[PDB]
Amino acid sequence: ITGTSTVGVGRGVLGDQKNINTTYSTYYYLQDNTRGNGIFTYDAKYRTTLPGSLWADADNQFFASYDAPAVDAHYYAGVTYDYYKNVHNRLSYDGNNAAIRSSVHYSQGYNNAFWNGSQMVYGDGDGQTFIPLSGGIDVVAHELTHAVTDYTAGLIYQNESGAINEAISDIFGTLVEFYANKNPDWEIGEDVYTPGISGDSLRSMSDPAKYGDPDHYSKRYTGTQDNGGVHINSGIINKAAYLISQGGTHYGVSVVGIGRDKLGKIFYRALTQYLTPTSNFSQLRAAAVQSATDLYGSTSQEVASVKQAFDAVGVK
Numbered sequence: 001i002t003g004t005s006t007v008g009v010g011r012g013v014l015g016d017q018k019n020i021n022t023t024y025s026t027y028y029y030l031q032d033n034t035r036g037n038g039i040f041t042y043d044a045k046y047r048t049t050l051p052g053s054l055w056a057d058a059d060n061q062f063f064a065s066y067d068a069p070a071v072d073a074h075y076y077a078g079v080t081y082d083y084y085k086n087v088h089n090r091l092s093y094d095g096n097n098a099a100i101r102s103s104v105h106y107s108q109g110y111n112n113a114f115w116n117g118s119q120m121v122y123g124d125g126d127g128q129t130f131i132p133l134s135g136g137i138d139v140v141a142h143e144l145t146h147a148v149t150d151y152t153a154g155l156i157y158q159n160e161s162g163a164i165n166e167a168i169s170d171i172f173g174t175l176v177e178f179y180a181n182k183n184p185d186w187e188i189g190e191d192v193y194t195p196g197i198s199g200d201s202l203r204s205m206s207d208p209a210k211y212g213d214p215d216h217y218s219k220r221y222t223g224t225q226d227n228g229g230v231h232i233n234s235g236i237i238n239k240a241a242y243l244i245s246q247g248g249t250h251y252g253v254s255v256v257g258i259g260r261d262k263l264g265k266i267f268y269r270a271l272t273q274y275l276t277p278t279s280n281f282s283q284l285r286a287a288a289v290q291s292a293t294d295l296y297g298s299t300s301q302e303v304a305s306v307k308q309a310f311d312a313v314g315v316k
């Protein structure tokens with residue numbers, strides 16, 4: 001809509017207060033004109049029809065419980081936009097400042113969130129397994145990174161390529177969580193998963209085996225479930241990324257950590273320049289080594305640490 005850019009105030013899913021960019025035209029709308037071609041948040045009204053109605057509010061204050069998932073979807077889309085622009089010089093998910101649209105209150109008791117090719121979609125969860133999924137910044141950024149992948153490498157969502165696709169989304173979901181300084185960790189989905197249970201998550205990047213996921217190529221899942229293990233085998237790559245950043249000793253291989261910024265630069269270059277739709281784990285290693293070589297030089301510690309980390313998880 002056309003109107004005056006304003007700043008409202010609201011509370012997110014976890015009860016935290018934040019300012020959000022809105023647009024005034026009789027009502028205040030969840031329309032952020034400050035980022036690219038805009039960030040737009042919609043009410044799906046518990047239907048499965050998309051996108052629903054552009055979110056309208058009478059007083060620019062968003063403290064109702066019904067408001068909370070919209071506040072966080074809107075705010076965390078903006079944080080993700082800022083991360084890709086400020087850190088990687090990428091303008092929105094397509095690199096051409098495409099508008100980011102999100103719908104909240106999708107369906108009823110729906111324990112999922114997804115990028116559907118043109119917008120974000122968030123369920124509210126069932127209140128036991130999940131609370132509204134836009135409350136997790138790493139979830140938001142994970143799903144928006146699938147859009148980045150679709151517009152660059154085009155990794156297909158099965159077998160090793162699909163596990164890479166998932167791991168890329170976990171890596172940048174985590175780097176956005178650190179960028180925002182929003183209770184950062186190397187776990188995925190901890191802020192919205194099992195509200196009754198403290199200290200768990202959907203999966204761990206620092207210790208995938210904590211939840212039974214593989215942390216070495218020799219332990220990879222080889223069956224047909226989960227599209228060939230896309231959420232299971234991602235642990236192999238997630239552990240390598242953790243080692244590249246933080247260092248450690250894993251299956252007897254010592255890795256010198258190089259930190260989070262260089263992790264992000266190496267993987268962003270690999271994704272945007274070198275990966276293809278059917279890249280496998282071995283090709284990811286080659287792409288990451290070449291990216292580190294491009295950025296830091298063939299004899300650098302950065303290249304040596306990438307090699308060490310992939311050796312540690314058994315990927316040659």
Ligand SMILES: [Ca+2]
Nearest residue numbers: 057059061062
């Ligand atoms: Ca209000």
Ligand SMILES: [Ca+2]
Nearest residue numbers: 138187188189
């Ligand atoms: Ca996390």
Ligand SMILES: [Ca+2]
Nearest residue numbers: 193194195197
């Ligand atoms: Ca929990």
Ligand SMILES: [Cl-]
Nearest residue numbers: 206207248249
């Ligand atoms: Cl560990």
Ligand SMILES: [Cl-]
Nearest residue numbers: 207209215250
């Ligand atoms: Cl371990």
Ligand SMILES: [Cl-]
Nearest residue numbers: 247248249250
């Ligand atoms: Cl470690």
Ligand SMILES: [Cl-]
Nearest residue numbers: 249250251252
């Ligand atoms: Cl170990």
Ligand SMILES: [Zn+2]
Nearest residue numbers: 113114115143
């Ligand atoms: Zn997803």
Ligand SMILES: [Zn+2]
Nearest residue numbers: 142146166169
């Ligand atoms: Zn995913």
Ligand SMILES: [Zn+2]
Nearest residue numbers: 182183184185
């Ligand atoms: Zn966290």
Ligand SMILES: [Zn+2]
Nearest residue numbers: 203211213232
């Ligand atoms: Zn798992």
Ligand SMILES: [Zn+2]
Nearest residue numbers: 226230231232
């Ligand atoms: Zn899965």
Ligand SMILES: [Zn+2]
Nearest residue numbers: 215249250251
């Ligand atoms: Zn280990």
Ligand SMILES: [Zn+2]
Nearest residue numbers: 206248249250
């Ligand atoms: Zn370890």
